[PDB]
Design a protein around this ligand. Structure first.
Ligand SMILES: *c1c(C)c(C)cc2c1nc1c(=O)[nH]c(=O)nc-1n2C[C@H](O)[C@H](O)[C@H](O)COP(=O)(O)O
Ligand SMILES: *c1c(C)c(C)cc2c1nc1c(=O)[nH]c(=O)nc-1n2C[C@H](O)[C@H](O)[C@H](O)COP(=O)(O)O
Ligand SMILES: Nc1ncnc2c1ncn2[C@@H]1O[C@H](COP(=O)(O)OP(=O)(O)O)[C@@H](O)[C@H]1O
Ligand SMILES: Nc1ncnc2c1ncn2[C@@H]1O[C@H](COP(=O)(O)OP(=O)(O)O)[C@@H](O)[C@H]1O
Ligand code: SF4
Ligand code: SF4
Lengths: 729, 729
């Protein structure tokens, strides 16, 4: 039964000329579809509509080619061709009884315009702090009028495309906020200086947009009410509440964020630094002055926390981005009282990393169907049922083997899942114990819960933990029709790394003064005072180990041959991670790698130490002057973070005996997850989901084709257009 | 007329079953189109076919989704959709009598598969040294047979698509090279160990592809004959030549490069480091052993250098990528003896920088129609002719103003171009005087030459240099119908920068101990011994000034608030630039910026010195602990490289008197290039090209729409497919 206290989340609420059916609201978020992948855009949003979300929004939607985010992918509403592509989404969302919203965007200099080559315009000329080679033209009064007109023409196309909700977007330090914020706005005319003057651009845009479409569409606005930068950008109790009072009469609904664009991880709070509800102290300030409905995101996954912010009067509506990606059916699950089916977001920001890299589609660590709904036909809650009695043995219960188990049981198969480990979750169990990573637990907590539930409904299925390791003969004599090897990866013990692909002389994790991540996380092997971490990985392991050891009292130096924490730029974790290492006194030596190791010392070299001039010097000889930067540094312990290898011994043994499978009635054995190749957790989860989805295909080791959303030559994007080459001569 | 010694370049040569009409060959190169923008792909290659190139190749062309380069854009030949898209290019290239070629690609772990999410396969499992989070599965024998079959199926699709030339691609350390090269290949079976074994994968692939399509298509191979890394990878006189001998009977034509993928600026050599012909010492080693036609790229633009390598017997064919982008008509121009019309590539690698960023279309510093042929209808050598006698005044002869003059004169307009400078070229004249950048001067040399010749045939046009600066009154009284303002930008003199968008206290380049780039390049202002460069720019200025200053004997420290030379990662200059700074003893302080300057000293701070934990602390205060890393450093001279600002005073004065334009018979005044917003040189050039092409449009200040190559919802990419959402249930 639904807890009756949760009934309030299912009450409707008026927003201008529209009604939201409940309090679950998907705020605008990127997915890597834009107006470019209309199947993905429409499936991803309409699965959530079917899942019960009251309103579904596009990501940021450019109003004109001079706000082109290429190389990143935004939605666009430039012309009739975009109207058609985006209407595929509004039509589909409407079929499930939800509203659709579009977030009208203009970036100023933050949009680098790499496709359009156009010049962005802004309140003053500046080079973007985020796109540092991108500059804008300072607007004159006619520029201001013409960009306001872009907004009006876009709002009109938006109504043509079937949208119910139209935003003017002034969060993440985009144009309306640029004019509001003296960090950007240095004008001394009537659009700069006092708050009334600084607000003028956004207020006139709202008035013009509302005048164009507002009796048909709700006019929303998204506002970074505090830049979380201190004085000198926007402060909630200085300009923020006061802007709200100025704009309140024009806005049908407030959508509130904090932070800027360069560090928008302050908005999309990674769980490493921020808990559910972290934005409350700023967001709550808006309902203190607004007489309109208000939401403000804060990684809300828990209906207990949701009813708290509503009954205490801090927000009227529950806005979510990530939680809707991890679980498009979150609302229906709360409505039906299926709390234990809720697939809770871990705030890892892998979904965001995709968009930040610029171009790739979204993926999600929890939800292997995000991005897959359209092109592979994978609905998160509906699985093809087996028509046979086949059984599957799965060796290994980390993200990949556990997801395979969950999906195969959902599809009706008999599944035996086994692991030496005491509990489900494989390498994630030690990872989630790293400083800050505690919520990454939820990935294996969800799978433990679901697998336990699923066992009750197939009676032949089985979960066996803390078992002896499976051997090739155990597998061969197990009795399963098909077998999945999901045995994971381990960190290298011998210095092998992506720069040289070879061991490092003297590297050996069995020695008393060297350790792998696993040995560090296990916490039995002694670690001395001075610790060097030798790093050839660009994600979280080395910085997380550095933080762990430094908080535990060690003097830590990281020697990195690749850009330290580079992938954390994309998950937005990097700025706070670097501040954390700095507070903790961790020393960083970038651009160095290690050519050999001995007890208590290691030799390092600057990676740019070879001569700059290449000549042909013949065979057997380097074409550059020799690198003479080598020097010795000391340590008491050396932690090797140099890369990973697949644990695929068992697979190798079974394959060498493939001639024996048929006589043992084994029809197939497949290799997934880290054991095939070291993957992101999201991608290991994906491989388990995919093999389970395709377990009946000719070769389940290899994905079948997905639908591609690429133009077909001979079909013009513009309706009635001419697709042929035409020179202007 | 053509020099008779160039006649050799126009002799045909047989390659297997096909005939090249001349010795001008466009090797495979990225353009940002692949099979996804079939308009762009077909227009870009077919203009060159019209321009006399004997063969035009697609870029690297994936044979299967488990070699997907997303976020970077490759061609693809995975299915019938791609066959239709690429056939637009083969049909268009054939219309002009050239051969069309495709480059069959499989990247191993170098392809990060961010769209497909499939697992790449390789000779041994490694993490790519270029994509450092991307790992492959080690190939067993069936894997090898399967990937070989992918090449075969792609080659059959290629013949369907109408290609004449099919490559097995084994350069830039892609898969055939990975099996060849013990840096990657650690196998101990019959595909590893000896040369014969290491070559077996590439040899079998060639035999299979030749078998499938060889009667119909020339089989070419691209080979990184030396990795330029010394022993430990491929060396030309060790494995290189011996491999050519083993494969010679299978290959119709050799296409030779040097270098790997992580540092492929050794192949696409930047003029900063490499002259025309820089590859000859390695390339000529192939004809020492091969009996087949051979080419090897080397930034060839001069026909004198071209006949040298053919008459000496070092190559049979002139392969080009960049020269063909700068001038699609280079071969016709040589054929007709129009040497002074040749637009010579400057080796800036801005074209490549787009590809490297991942996703955007190619652009070109010399050729402002690259990427624009299809979507704007801009042919590089055909100009719509004016039908009126309108005159245009152009103030400033830098890359934008001189491009605008050139195009307007080619279009039949009367133009008067004026500048205070003694020579055409604007800010490029000092830029090209920086260490290594002398070849960048070709951009202005081309325009100086072209403008001089256009004046001889456009008799009412005029060039005036060494002029007094134009004032607003001079412009208003000048007598032109239209005016273009192209007055450029300057480096900031008060510390204004992209981090704070404000001046720095104490910054002022009028002080004797502080200098701008222009003051350094001018050479008059004295510079002291200890130099600090303060940098907030990510491209070439700060590194290039550091080189110049350290080579002149100064002790140089670079304090950089942004990632130093970040943009040079994309131009492939970064690795030799860092080696150059290291060998000159230039010190770098990354992650710091500057809070105030005084005579001989400046206060710097660590950019990550703020506390890592954000909390609500109310207005007037930072949400984090204070940054306490501030410290002073001394200098004798401080070079300010903090950002640029438009020089738009003349513009602002004319706009302030817009009410007088009609009295003075001025129909419009437009603002282009760096004076509208500081741009890359390629983009400043584009703005002048654009306004010239669009001088008759309603508002030439703003680009008209271009044709968009994005899918139309309702049309499936696969012929006969179903575009509608369908779930697998
Ligand atoms: C993209 C990505 C994938 C994320 C998760 C957030 C996001 C994305 N793109 C956005 C955009 O197009 N416009 C916009 O206004 N906001 C965008 N976001 C931020 C998102 O809307 C939320 O503000 C944050 O994710 C925090 O909310 P929550 O995920 O904790 O609920
Ligand atoms: C992309 C880019 C834009 C550049 C100019 C070169 C290039 C690109 N992509 C390539 C790819 O798809 N396959 C391939 O084999 N080579 C590719 N290239 C390298 C190019 O082919 C030449 O080897 C170099 O540019 C050197 O030749 P040149 O430009 O000096 O004539
Ligand atoms: N022979 C084996 N028998 C049983 N379990 C195994 C065996 N080999 C490895 N495992 C288990 O396989 C799991 C792989 O999990 P993990 O490393 O998280 O991989 P992934 O991320 O691919 O899911 C580990 O929990 C490990 O205990
Ligand atoms: N008032 C003026 N009258 C004539 N020329 C000017 C005036 N102001 C600036 N210039 C010239 O304009 C040119 C601008 O060139 P440049 O800086 O290279 O801009 P861009 O990169 O946009 O082409 C310089 O050569 C400069 O001398
Ligand atoms: S990738 Fe991590 S963050 Fe993003 S929605 Fe999924 S799960 Fe939450
Ligand atoms: S961008 Fe530069 S290197 Fe590339 S083709 Fe054009 S002029 Fe040559």
């Amino acid at each position: 039964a639904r807890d009756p206290k949760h009934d309030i989340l299912f009450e409707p609420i008026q927003i201008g000329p529209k009604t939201l059916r409940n309090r679950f609201y998907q705020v605008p978020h990127c997915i890597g579809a834009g107006s470019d992948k209309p199947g993905f855009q429409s499936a991803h949003r309409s699965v959530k509509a079917e899942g019960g979300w009251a309103a579904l929004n596009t990501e940021y939607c450019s109003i004109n080619p001079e706000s082109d985010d290429t190389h990143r992918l935004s939605a666009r509403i430039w012309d009739e061709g975009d109207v058609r592509n985006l209407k595929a989404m509004t039509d589909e969302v409407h079929k499930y009884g939800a509203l659709a919203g579009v977030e009208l965007w203009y970036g100023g200099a933050h949009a680098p315009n790499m496709e359009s080559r156009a010049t962005p315009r802004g309140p003053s000329q500046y080079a973007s702090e985020f796109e540092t080679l991108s500059y804008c033209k300072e607007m004159d009064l006619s520029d201001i009028a013409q960009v306001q007109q872009f907004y009006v023409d876009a709002a009109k196309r938006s109504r043509d495309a079937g949208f119910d909700i139209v935003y003017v977007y002034g969060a993440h330090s985009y144009l309306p906020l640029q004019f509001l914020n003296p960090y950007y706005n240095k004008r001394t005319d009537k659009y700069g200086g006092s708050l009334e003057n600084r607000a003028r651009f956004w207020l006139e845009t709202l008035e013009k947009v509302k005048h164009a479409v507002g009796s048909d569409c709700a006019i929303a606005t998204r506002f970074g009410v505090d830049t979380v930068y201190g004085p000198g950008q926007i402060e909630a109790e200085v300009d923020g509440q006061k802007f709200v009072e100025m704009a309140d009469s024009l806005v049908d609904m407030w959508d509130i964020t904090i932070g800027d664009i360069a560090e928008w991880g302050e908005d999309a709070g990674p769980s490493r630094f921020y808990q559910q509800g972290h934005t409350i102290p700023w967001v709550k300030l808006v309902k203190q002055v607004s007489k309109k409905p208000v939401l403000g995101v804060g990684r809300y996954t828990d209906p207990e926390k949701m009813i708290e912010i509503v009954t205490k009067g801090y927000a009227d509506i529950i806005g979510c981005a990530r939680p809707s990606i991890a679980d498009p059916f979150l609302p229906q699950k709360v409505e039906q009282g299926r709390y234990d089916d809720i697939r809770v977001c871990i705030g890892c920001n892998v979904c965001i990393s995709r968009w930040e890299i610029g171009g790739p589609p979204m993926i999600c660590t929890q939800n292997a169907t995000a991005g897959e709904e359209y092109r592979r036909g994978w609905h998160p809650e509906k699985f093809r049922q087996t028509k046979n009695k086949d059984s599957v043995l799965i060796v290994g219960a980390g993200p990949s083997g556990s997801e395979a188990a969950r999906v195969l049981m959902e599809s009706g198969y008999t599944v035996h899942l086994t692991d030496t480990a005491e509990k489900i979750g494989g390498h994630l169990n030690q990872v989630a114990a790293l400083p800050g990573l505690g919520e990454w637990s939820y990935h294996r907590d969800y799978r433990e819960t679901q697998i336990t539930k699923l066992l009750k409904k197939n009676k032949e299925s089985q979960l066996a933990l803390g078992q002896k390791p499976m051997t090739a003969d155990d597998v061969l004599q197990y009795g399963a029709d098909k077998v999945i090897i999901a045995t994971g990866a381990r960190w290298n013990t011998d210095g092998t790394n992506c720069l040289t692909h070879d061991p490092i002389p003297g590297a050996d994790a069995s020695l008393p003064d060297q350790l792998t991540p696993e040995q560090v996380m296990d916490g039995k092997k002694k670690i001395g005072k001075r610790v060097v971490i030798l790093n050839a990985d660009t994600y979280f392991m080395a910085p997380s180990l550095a933080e762990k050891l430094a908080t535990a009292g060690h003097e830590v130096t990281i020697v990195s041959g690749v850009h330290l924490a580079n992938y954390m730029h994309f998950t937005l974790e990097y700025p706070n991670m670097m501040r954390r290492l700095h507070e903790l006194h961790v020393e960083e030596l970038g651009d160095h790698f290690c050519s050999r190791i001995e007890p208590g010392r290691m030799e390092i070299y600057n990676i740019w130490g070879d001569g700059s001039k290449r000549t042909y010097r013949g065979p057997g000889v380097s074409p550059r002057d020799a690198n003479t930067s080598h020097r010795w540094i000391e340590f008491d312990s050396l932690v090797l973070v140099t890369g990973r290898h697949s644990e695929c011994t068992l697979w190798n043994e079974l394959k060498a005996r493939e001639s024996e499978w048929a006589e043992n009635d084994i029809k197939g054995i497949y290799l997934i997850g880290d054991a095939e190749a070291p993957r992101l957790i999201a991608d290991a989860t994906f491989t388990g989901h995919r093999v389970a989805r395709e377990i009946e295909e000719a070769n389940p080791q290899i994905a079948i084709p997905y639908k591609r959303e690429t133009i077909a030559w001979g079909t013009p994007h513009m309706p009635g257009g001419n697709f042929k080459i035409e020179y202007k001569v």
